[PDB]
């Protein structure tokens, strides 16, 4: 049918398409744009989240007076990031490259979906569906102000192969720099101890280490 399977490497290297799936293009992992301090996201499981050409300011805007402005105000862009070390201070121009996650759009045989266990055990792909990869349940995010976004739990975009406390980076549009700010938050589905119904959550603060056994698992499947 020509379903588009999208993969984000979460590294500065392009991800390879599954054997039998021809690549339509590779690009940069786009999370969301922020214009007039209002976020507009791209579903990480849809081809729109894979932009062929990167820029700290990939868009422009116009007002009714037939006037348009490109990189002439205070807008931003957010991208999935790599394991590149948390920056000193903002990284500029060519120094940004190592931080932007890469992606590939592949023409697939059938539709792919994501399943979540909300458990430490990996969810089983439905009967008649095979596994393309396993990962962690990425639900939503916030950064500047309270702007942010989230993924569709049935979309492959809600299943990242690598868990990251901070899976994305912020780029200052007109300044041509990107950086990691303290208000960046990633939200993930939790591993629930109970089998099916958790009426009372047991609050807790998790340090680096126990973190992963606390993150829900997922699998991306295709018939």
């Amino acid at each position: 049918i020509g379903y588009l399977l999208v993969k984000h490497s979460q590294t500065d290297q392009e991800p390879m398409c599954p054997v039998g799936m021809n690549k339509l293009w590779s690009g940069y992992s786009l999370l969301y744009f922020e214009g007039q301090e209002k976020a507009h996201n791209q579903d990480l499981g849809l081809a729109g989240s894979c932009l062929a050409r990167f820029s700290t300011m990939p868009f422009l805007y116009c007002n009714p007076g037939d006037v348009c402005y490109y990189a002439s105000r205070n807008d931003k862009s957010y991208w999935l990031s790599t394991t590149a070390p948390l920056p000193m201070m903002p990284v500029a121009e060519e120094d940004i490259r190592p931080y932007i996650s890469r992606c590939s759009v592949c023409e697939a045989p059938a539709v792919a979906i994501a399943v979540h266990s909300q458990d430490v055990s990996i969810p089983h792909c439905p009967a008649g569906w095979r596994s393309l990869w396993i990962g962690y349940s990425f639900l939503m995010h916030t950064a500047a102000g309270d702007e942010g976004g989230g993924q569709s739990l049935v979309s492959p975009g809600s299943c990242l192969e690598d868990f990251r406390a901070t899976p994305f980076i912020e780029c200052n549009g007109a300044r041509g720099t990107c950086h990691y700010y303290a208000n960046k938050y990633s939200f993930w589905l939790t591993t629930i101890p109970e089998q099916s119904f958790q009426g009372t959550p047991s609050a807790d603060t998790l340090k680096a280490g126990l973190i992963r056994t606390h993150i829900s698992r997922c699998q991306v499947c295709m018939k």
């Binding site: 809600s158 939200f187 959550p201």
Partner: protein
Amino acid sequence: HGFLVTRHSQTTDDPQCPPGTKILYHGYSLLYVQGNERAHGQDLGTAGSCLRKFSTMPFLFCNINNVCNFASRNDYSYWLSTPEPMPMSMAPITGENIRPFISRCAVCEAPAMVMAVHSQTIQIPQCPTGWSSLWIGYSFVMHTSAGAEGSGQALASPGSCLEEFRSAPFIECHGRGTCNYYANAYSFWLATIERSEMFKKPTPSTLKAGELRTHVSRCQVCMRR
């Protein structure tokens, strides 16, 4: 080929997959969550709105220092609810007492693709030629609750077609473990419009019990061939 279609019972009973589709799994009806004051919903027509496990706080958040916090702040989760009555006290529901209020769902695999059509009248919109009926309902558009935050449904999706109209179709839960219906919660539905009134100033109206669905648009979820 298999295309997923999600159905919500709006009761504690697991719904049946519509005729022509097969069950994959059942779960609880997740409407949306609100983290760090930002709402994020799951389209009711997608399997993402049907989770295998329920929790008043099904998620956690992690910071730049690689520390994650769970149910420690003031976040929310919203789920489609059942006809279960609120205690006379009007005080928050907690623990296992919550179960009777949570709607159930079914994630089904269909042979073709499904869509929803809206009439914007009291009449049930007929399925497009070559498409068969899965179910009928009421045009559900969007909603808001705490902090006036909320989300909505894609009008082309089955999620925008709720089988049972409820002025308060969902319940609000907190990481604290409490759930309840609050007065500020609003449900938005497509209104009925007469071809002659399309370009006329809308006539304001306030409807009461036993007269609500009078102004609500009807819909039908259809599947190819």
